[PDB]
């Protein structure tokens, strides 16, 4: 029952602009032990499986561009896209990997004009 919440549910940005989307949980995701935040971010384009963008709240997955930056700790996290590109139009999900069941956020549908 850790409840994951993404905001906003959808938003329209323009190319080159900086994008910020939030993800919050009802319990801290910080493992008092290795001090790691168990939170992942995924990008999903139409008719495709989502892809991991960031894990442990801030570590970029191999192959993921530098314009994607995860941040935060505890219960409030963020995914920033420093300078959004047209191909960044997708759905973004966050998933908590702290406790089972590893719940997902509702998603943020990012429209790039």
């Amino acid at each position: 029952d850790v409840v994951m919440t993404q905001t906003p549910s959808s938003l329209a940005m323009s190319v080159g602009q900086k994008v910020t989307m939030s993800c919050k949980s009802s319990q801290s995701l910080l493992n008092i032990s290795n001090q790691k935040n168990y939170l992942a971010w995924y990008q999903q384009k139409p008719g495709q499986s989502p892809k991991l963008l960031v894990y442990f709240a801030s570590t970029r997955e191999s192959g993921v561009p530098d314009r994607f930056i995860g941040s935060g700790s505890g219960t409030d996290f963020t995914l920033t896209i420093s300078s959004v590109q047209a191909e960044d139009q997708a759905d973004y999900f966050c998933q908590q990997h702290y406790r089972a069941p590893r719940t997902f956020g509702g998603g943020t549908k990012l429209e790039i004009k």
Binding site: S49, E61, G63, A100, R102, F104
Partner: protein, 117 residues
């Protein structure tokens, strides 16, 4: 090079039993954790269960009653079985892995669609 491919039944009548196979290549299951996730437009994304490199298994508490996860390291396959199927269970079923040492930390499968009707 690394690929997670899931196989399924396609359409299946309710109160029947589901049975899916996650076929892995490129990696060793002893070093990667495999999760089972399903997605649908109405329901969103849901975590079903997982099986750790060292054989430990976890389930979505709300679904444990009907689920059953297992693996076969020698064949690099992971299995999921779901009972008491209801039309409510239609979704795209995926196996996803996480571990260290590959080109990537995780690999999401292609998904297998389950149409309960």
């Amino acid at each position: 090079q690394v690929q997670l491919v899931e196989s399924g039944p396609g359409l299946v009548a309710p109160s029947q039993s589901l049975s899916i196979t996650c076929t892995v290549s490129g990696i060793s299951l002893s070093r990667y954790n495999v999760h089972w996730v399903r997605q649908s437009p109405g329901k969103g994304l849901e975590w079903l269960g997982m099986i750790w490199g060292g054989g430990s298994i976890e389930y979505n508490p709300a679904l444990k009653s009907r689920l059953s996860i297992s693996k076969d390291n020698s064949k690099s396959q992971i299995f999921l079985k779901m009972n008491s199927l209801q039309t409510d269970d239609s979704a795209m079923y995926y196996c996803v892995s996480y571990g260290y040492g590959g080109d990537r930390f995780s690999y999401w499968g292609q998904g297998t669609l389950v149409t309960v009707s």
